Design a protein around this ligand. Structure first.
Ligand SMILES: Nc1nc2c(ncn2[C@@H]2O[C@H](COP(=O)(O)OP(=O)(O)OP(=O)(O)O)[C@@H](O)[C@H]2O)c(=O)[nH]1
Ligand SMILES: Nc1nc2c(ncn2[C@@H]2O[C@H](COP(=O)(O)OP(=O)(O)O)[C@@H](O)[C@H]2O)c(=O)[nH]1
Ligand SMILES: Nc1nc(NCc2ccc3c(c2)OCO3)cc(-c2cccc3[nH]ccc23)n1
Ligand SMILES: [Ca+2]
Ligand SMILES: [Mg+2]
Ligand SMILES: [Mg+2]
Lengths: 440, 421, 59
């Protein structure tokens, strides 16, 4: 049992959902009609993939997922698209008018009109679970829905499911790909409001994903499809321990124990390798050592920051595919003798390692090479606080003039929520500083 | 499913409205009978924004036509495409307004406004999800300037949560010698500052100077000015009419473009009047602006650039970054990432490549200064005031309108001088 | 085990009360903004009536 429910909020959350569920279907051999011929237990089972898929008596394998947006056109593409038969219609929830890039509309004015329906549908999913483990929440920081409705939802989930775990996949804004000037406001408001309600959040900086797509896939101008396929590869690496069996697989929850030393310090840095085109992958087999080395190259990070100017508090490696422990240990030994990996003094320096033998998958016609072996590193490093600093700086620049603030006040917000959120972010930056100091 | 209701008021409003509907009907492959005869599903994908579907797969503009002069009702109906408009959507008075704002706003126009609202309400009731309203009018006459701002105020009362957008043609002595034009514009601006979310200042000064100097038309007609206006308006509605990637509505655009509620008067531009660098450089050139303002005499609060045609998105990105880096002093440092770019694959008629510019620049104060000067030139001698007091207006309303437009100027100057440090 | 139950319940309680307070405060603020805007428009309708009267009583 121990199932997981996925919730995809706003455009970015939905489209990442599409990439993730397509990839999960390919990894498990589920067709777009939901049939899974390899699954001989019809209508149920306690196989590892049932953590993410339920089963109907008719043999359909149905994502344990809700998609929510305040306007319909993205989810309408899901309703009409290739995987329309995968999802029950009650799982796809839409309003008529979006949040117009305004946190206040997603959290209050528009969000209040749909929150109870969304909770009722999530409840329908939870009641089908025999041991629900928790929630995965996919959303942007920058949109009105991804910020404000996600915050509202997280608060209500804490009420309705208590301390039941909640994980985020959060799209961190970059000016390089389709941005709104008020995105820093929405990012600080949602980070403040969600902070006490989230157990662990994997931030994905669109600028990092964009750079990786340009540099490693030779894509001149990456689209959301390129970025989401790569993001989905990282998400799949993270959830693979929940979705496959195996003797060297290491539960995500067990990494979560190691990744989170204090409730507020819960933002791991993800690094993924190899991201390589088919043209470059040909006659060039990448070894365990080569991909593990890549893990410590900042150009492969999901968030732009410099781990070389912070301290590690945890460092986990999630391998999948043709990987045996002997090669992992030799590669780690090399990295320890060669790289600037400094831990805080209050935590051991051992790397935690997981291996899944199910090999990586790519979507047909994609820009990612199929590889025999891949790795996702999740590190808890103080350097990630740099991303808050960049966002906090942009917030300050605008807030000193109250630029755009009237759009929020007009939907019923008060300036006190702006300054409260900003002060909570200041205290977060201070926490990340304090945890990196050495003990007496 | 994302309906806009369009309103055109007075002679100017109805003329540029008609040109706008001509141009976009052509872009969507809609003929004067309302039949679709295009070649591409991209033409119909967002047709509902501006067109209703009637019986027979007819597409009918969601458009209301208002004047105190019924001769424009005839001229619109016989003008190219006159049958495409819904006949019940023609709302016309009798005796004109004689370039008297008070007739448009308080007396004759108040008499007609309820029938205009009846047509507005019938159109709105059948919207799946109305996003809001756009009004085309001039500010220099009597009907559009006074009655249009009345309509704006009444719509705001009935649809307080919808977006109200205007395309407002600002008067110039080079096009009209009517001496009372600055009164009508100041009185209108006072209304607009309070009741619209965005106003495109389409300045007859700039359109005349473009037709004369740049396009080499020795005797510019209204047709030549309106050709420029219609090209601008087509450009500025392109992103909501062909989407491609962008997923927006009028409110999200407004939220991206309007940092302070009163400072919502935009300078439109167009290029060409060709490489992507040339489009980009020209689009930021004072000579391509549809408001007679030098953007290098102020700073941009916000900018939208819309490119139309087949071109490299890589090259567009590189050139927008180049122009921002090389012109960084003209962008306020305390609004990061304040320049937004849209690309539509479908070019306008007769061009391979074009650019439309929308700037929220503090240099727009130069426009308001101009009008303000002409206002004062008359108000200091109380010239022609009896035209307005005879309709019940007090001098006090003129004093307040002047004072509010001067306050708007001072506020634009304040944000031009503000600094981050 | 009782302390753990109590802490979970207190977290649920405090989040429920915080959310309800925020949503109420937001509703009141939004309604007050709309009521002020409408009141300004009604002041305009009053002024337009005084204008039409002034014009009548000029004749
Ligand atoms: N990585 C990634 N980012 C996306 C995607 N779609 C949108 N974004 C980012 O999300 C932010 C915009 O927010 P959206 O998710 O589009 O907004 P929303 O949740 O729909 O909220 P509203 O539309 O304002 O009501 C920008 O930072 C975008 O770059 C996507 O498919 N992938
Ligand atoms: N650019 C442009 N300006 C116009 C046009 N028609 C009128 N104007 C301007 O509009 C002003 C006259 O106002 P008008 O709209 O015709 O008065 P009304 O229709 O009776 O309310 C003058 O200052 C003209 O310069 C037009 O077709 N194009
Ligand atoms: N405010 C604003 N901006 C505009 N420019 C383009 C743009 C593209 C992408 C963007 C963006 C802006 O900002 C976020 O990403 C057009 C408009 C408009 C006004 C009035 C009526 C209208 N009918 C259709 C459109 C429109 N209104
Ligand atoms: Ca090779
Ligand atoms: Mg959206
Ligand atoms: Mg007139």
């Amino acid at each position: 049992m121990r199932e997981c429910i996925s919730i995809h909020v706003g455009q970015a959350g939905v489209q990442i959902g599409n990439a993730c569920w397509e990839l999960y279907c390919l990894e498990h051999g589920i067709q777009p009609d939901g049939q899974m011929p390899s699954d001989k237990t019809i209508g149920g089972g306690d196989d590892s993939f049932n953590t993410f898929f339920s089963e109907t008596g008719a043999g359909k394998h149905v994502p344990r997922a809700v998609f929510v947006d305040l306007e319909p056109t993205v989810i309408d593409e899901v309703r009409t698209g290739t995987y329309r038969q995968l999802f029950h219609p009650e799982q796809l929830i839409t309003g008529k008018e979006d949040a117009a890039n305004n946190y206040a509309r997603g959290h209050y004015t528009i969000g209040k009109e749909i929150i109870d329906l969304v909770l009722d549908r999530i409840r329908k999913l939870a009641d089908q679970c025999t041991g629900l483990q928790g929630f995965l929440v996919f959303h942007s920081f920058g949109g009105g829905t991804g910020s404000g409705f996600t915050s509202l939802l997280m608060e209500r989930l804490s009420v309705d499911y208590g301390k039941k775990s909640k994980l985020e996949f959060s799209i961190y804004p970059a000016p390089q790909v389709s941005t709104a000037v008020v995105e820093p406001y929405n990012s600080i408001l949602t980070t403040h409001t969600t902070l006490e309600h989230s157990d662990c959040a994997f931030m994905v900086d669109n600028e990092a994903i964009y750079d990786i797509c340009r540099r490693n896939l030779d894509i001149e101008r990456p689209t959301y499809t390129n970025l989401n396929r790569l993001i989905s590869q990282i998400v799949s690496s993270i959830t693979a321990s929940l979705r496959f069996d195996g003797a060297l697989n290491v539960d995500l929850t067990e990494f979560q124990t190691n990744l989170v030393p204090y409730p507020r310090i819960h933002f791991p840095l993800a690094t993924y390798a190899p991201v390589i085109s088919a043209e470059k992958a040909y006659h060039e087999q990448l070894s365990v050592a080569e991909i593990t080395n890549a893990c410590f190259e900042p150009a492969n990070q999901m968030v732009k920051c410099d781990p070389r100017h912070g301290k590690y508090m945890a460092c986990c490696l999630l391998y999948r595919g043709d990987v045996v422990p002997k090669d992992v240990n030799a590669a780690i030994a090399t990295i320890k003798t060669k790289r600037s990996i400094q831990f805080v003094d209050w935590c051991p320096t051992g790397f935690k390692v997981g291996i899944n033998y199910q090999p990586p998958t790519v979507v047909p016609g994609g820009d990612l090479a199929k590889v025999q072996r891949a790795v996702c590193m999740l590190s808890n490093t103080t350097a990630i606080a740099e991303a808050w600093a960049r966002l906090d700086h942009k917030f300050d620049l605008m807030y000193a003039k109250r630029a755009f603030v009237h759009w929020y006040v007009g939907e019923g917000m008060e300036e006190g929520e702006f300054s409260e959120a900003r002060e909570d972010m200041a205290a977060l930056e201070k926490d990340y500083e304090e945890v990196g100091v050495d003990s007496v | 499913m994302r309906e806009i209701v369009h309103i055109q008021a007075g002679q100017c409003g109805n003329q540029i409205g008609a040109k706008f509907w001509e141009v976009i009907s052509d872009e969507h492959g809609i003929d004067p009978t309302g039949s679709y005869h295009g070649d591409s599903d991209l033409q119909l994908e967002r047709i509902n924004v501006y067109y209703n579907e009637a019986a027979g797969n007819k597409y009918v503009p969601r458009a209301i036509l208002v004047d105190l002069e019924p001769g424009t009702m005839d001229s619109v109906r016989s003008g190219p495409f006159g049958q495409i408009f819904r006949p019940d959507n023609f709302v016309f008075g009798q005796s004109g307004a004689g370039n008297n704002w008070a007739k448009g706003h308080y007396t004759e126009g108040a008499e007609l406004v309820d029938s205009v609202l009846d047509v507005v309400r019938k159109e709105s009731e059948s919207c799946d999800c109305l996003q809001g309203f756009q009004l085309t009018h001039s500010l220099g006459g009597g009907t559009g300037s006074g009655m249009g701002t009345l309509l704006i105020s009444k719509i705001r009362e009935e649809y307080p949560d919808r977006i109200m957008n205007t395309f407002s043609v600002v008067p110039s002595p080079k096009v009209s010698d009517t001496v009372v034009e600055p009164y009508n514009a100041t009185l209108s601006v006072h209304q607009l500052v309070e009741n619209t979310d965005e106003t495109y200042c389409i300045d007859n000064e700039a359109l005349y100077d473009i037709c004369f100097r740049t396009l080499k038309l020795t005797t510019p007609t209204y047709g030549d000015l309106n050709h420029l206006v219609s090209a601008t308006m087509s450009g500025v509605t392109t992103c909501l009419r062909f989407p491609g990637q962008l997923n927006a509505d009028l409110r999200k655009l407004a939220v991206n473009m309007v940092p302070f509620p009163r400072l919502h008067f935009f300078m439109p531009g167009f290029a060409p009047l060709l490489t992507v660098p040339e489009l980009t450089q020209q689009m930021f050139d004072a000579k391509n602006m549809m408001a007679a303002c030098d953007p290098r005499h102020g700073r941009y609060l916000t900018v939208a650039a819309v490119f139309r045609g087949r071109m490299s998105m890589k090259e567009v990105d590189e050139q927008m970054l180049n122009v921002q880096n090389k012109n960084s002093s003209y962008f306020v440092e305390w609004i990061p990432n304040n320049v937004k770019t849209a690309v539509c694959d479908i070019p306008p008629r007769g061009l391979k490549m074009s650019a439309t510019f929308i700037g929220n620049s503090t240099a727009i104060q130069e426009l308001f200064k101009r009008i303000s000067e002409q206002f004062t030139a008359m108000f200091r001698r109380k010239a022609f005031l009896h035209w307005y007091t005879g309709e019940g207006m007090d001098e006090m309303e003129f004093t307040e309108a002047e004072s509010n437009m001067n306050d708007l100027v001072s506020e634009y100057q304040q944000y031009q001088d503000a600094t981050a440090d | 085990i009782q302390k753990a139950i109590e802490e979970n319940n207190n977290f649920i309680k405090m989040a429920k009360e915080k959310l309800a307070q925020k949503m109420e405060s937001n509703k009141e603020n939004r309604e007050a903004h709309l009521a002020a805007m409408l009141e300004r428009l009604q002041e305009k309708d009053k002024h337009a009536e005084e204008v039409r009267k002034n014009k009548e009583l000029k004749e």
